[PDB]
Homo-oligomer: 106 residues x 3
């Protein structure tokens, strides 16, 4: 999907995590987010359209999704053990990564 | 499989490697060990049950199977080249990675 | 496929790229090259037959294909955006990595 569609998936699903009751719900939402971050990593953002793929910008752009995925995995690990509240508090910490890339490239 | 079962798999097949006649026997046994190592890496050990996935402890545990798997691959390469005695020796060097992790987490 | 077959493939498609009209041909060629590099990374070159899979030499051999594959990925990206001329320029810089390996290990 488009960079746009993937970001939607990230955004809506972060909302789903915040108001989840059980860990299955957090797990499912974290799994959809993981898929969409891997896919958003393949897109060229409008701001970078002039840059070759080995430039520091493009590489730092793909690095942003490497971190986010790493963080989603942490939250996934917690959801899998039924630890709902620490998995939610793990997902909160994704935002810093979201905002930071947006400061740079959005 | 869980941790205990996986460690049994590691142990028994290391013993097969010691007794092995040909490269095929070694190769087969290393493959099983590879898979058991990758499976055990997914588990939380009892000593670390209370630990965050982000822990220095959980990461150093996960890393121990990363070292182990890389060593298996070294031994796997030699088994593939028909080199039994050098595959056998490569597997004897696994032992130290066994011992270091058990010292911390067993 | 042995080393020779994979290198033949590497050589052939590099030419295809050089005389190509459009991005599709370049992309098709680069996709065949990538498969060949990954497959050649599995081979023990005749010069390093005695060498341990642990060797600085063997490790350095594997690393060469890692660089080649990354450079092919750079070139794939460009052909995908439909930037023929600049994908071709990216493919021209591959020869650096071909030659450096040949001087050592061929
Ligand atoms: C879970 C964390 C994230 C959330 C909730 C999120 C959410 C969003 C939302 C709602 C948009 C606007 C969608 C639109 O109006 O089309 C957006 C756009 C964007 N995001 Fe994120 N995002 C996250 C992570 C990231 C990261 C880590 C990066 C950097 C690699 C990134 C890069 C971008 C870019 C470049 C745009 C602009 C899209 C465009 O205008 O074409 N996002 N994001
Ligand atoms: C090939 C090398 C290895 C061998 C031969 C080996 C063998 C064993 C054996 C025989 C046990 C007996 C306990 C049981 O029956 O469950 C065991 C347990 C255990 N092993 Fe290993 N192991 C190896 C590598 C590792 C590594 C690298 C780690 C850590 C990264 C590790 C972590 C553990 C832990 C945490 C236990 C105790 C689990 C529990 O309390 O249920 N092992 N292993
Ligand atoms: C696109 C880049 C490359 C091209 C076009 C290329 C091309 C070739 C060609 C045409 C041969 C001779 C085949 C024959 O025997 O007739 C060859 C041999 C060889 N190349 Fe490459 N090569 C490339 C990259 C590499 C890399 C990255 C490495 C190692 C990291 C490497 C290592 C070798 C070795 C070891 C041989 C000797 C094969 C043998 O004697 O059996 N090459 N190469
Ligand atoms: C250093 C890095 O990750 N660069 C790249 C960054 C990229 C960012 C978005 C889309 N593609 C790429 C890309 N594609 C092929 C090769 C490299 C890249
Ligand atoms: C740094 C690291 O490897 N941490 C982890 C360590 C882990 C150790 C056992 C089981 N799972 C994990 C884990 N799971 C998801 C995300 C991270 C980890
Ligand atoms: C660092 C590295 O990639 N060394 C190796 C380099 C290799 C080069 C050709 C074929 N196999 C290997 C290999 N196989 C198993 C384990 C390690 C290697
Ligand atoms: Ni897509
Ligand atoms: Ni985990
Ligand atoms: Ni299991
Ligand atoms: Ni190998
Ligand atoms: Ni082959
Ligand atoms: Ni790309």
């Amino acid at each position: 999907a488009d960079l746009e569609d993937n970001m939607e998936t990230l955004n809506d699903n972060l909302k789903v995590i915040e108001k989840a009751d059980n860990a299955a719900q957090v797990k499912d939402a974290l799994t959809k987010m993981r898929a969409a971050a891997l896919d958003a990593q393949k897109a060229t953002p409008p701001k970078l359209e002039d840059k070759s793929p080995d430039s520091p910008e493009m590489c730092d752009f793909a690095a942003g999704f490497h971190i986010l995925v790493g963080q989603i995995d942490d939250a996934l690990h917690l959801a899998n053990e039924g630890k709902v509240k620490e998995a939610q508090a793990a997902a909160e910490q994704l935002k810093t990564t979201c905002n930071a890339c947006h400061q740079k490239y959005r």
